[PDB]
C-alpha cells in the first residue's frame, strides 16, 4: 500500500537521529514521537501522542510496511513497521533511531493500521 510506504519511508529519513524523551521530529525522537511524525508528516491524521493509546488506536494491522508494531498490553514501545519482520524505532536514550528485527525486542506484539 502507498500510505504505508509512505509512512516507512519518513520513518527511515529519521534513521540516525537522536533519542529524546518527548521527541517528535524533526531532529529528536522518543518510540511514539517517531510513530507520530511519520504520519503526520504524510498527512495520515489521528494518530495518539504516546505508546499505550497507539497500540490501541486505528485498526487491526497484519505488519505491512507503515503499520506500527506495539510491545505490551499495555504498550510501552513501538515502531514503524518495514514489511519484511523489521520495524524502524527511536530505541531508547542513549540510542539513535534504527532498523532492528521485531523479533529481538523478545515480547509480546501487535500491530495497528491508522492509514
Given at each position: 500500500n502507498a500510505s504505508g510506504s509512505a509512512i516507512l519511508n519518513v520513518a527511515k529519513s529519521r534513521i540516525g537521529?537522536?533519542?529524546m524523551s518527548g521527541g517528535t521530529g524533526?531532529?529528536?525522537f522518543?518510540?511514539?514521537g517517531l510513530?507520530?511524525?511519520s504520519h503526520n508528516q504524510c498527512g495520515v491524521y489521528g494518530?495518539?501522542?504516546?505508546?499505550?493509546?497507539?497500540?490501541?488506536?486505528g485498526k487491526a494491522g497484519?505488519?505491512?510496511?507503515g503499520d506500527v508494531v506495539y510491545?505490551?498490553?499495555p504498550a510501552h514501545h513501538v515502531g514503524i513497521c518495514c514489511g519484511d519482520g523489521s520495524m524502524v524505532h527511536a530505541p531508547r536514550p542513549?540510542?539513535?533511531?534504527?532498523?532492528?528485527?521485531?523479533?529481538?525486542?523478545?515480547?509480546?506484539?501487535?500491530?495497528?493500521r491508522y492509514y
Open positions: 537521529k537522536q533519542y524533526p531532529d529528536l522518543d518510540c511514539s510513530v507520530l511524525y494518530v495518539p501522542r504516546v505508546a499505550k493509546d497507539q497500540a490501541r488506536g497484519s505488519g505491512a510496511a510491545f505490551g498490553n542513549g540510542k539513535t533511531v534504527c532498523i532492528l528485527k521485531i523479533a529481538y525486542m523478545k515480547e509480546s506484539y501487535g500491530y495497528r
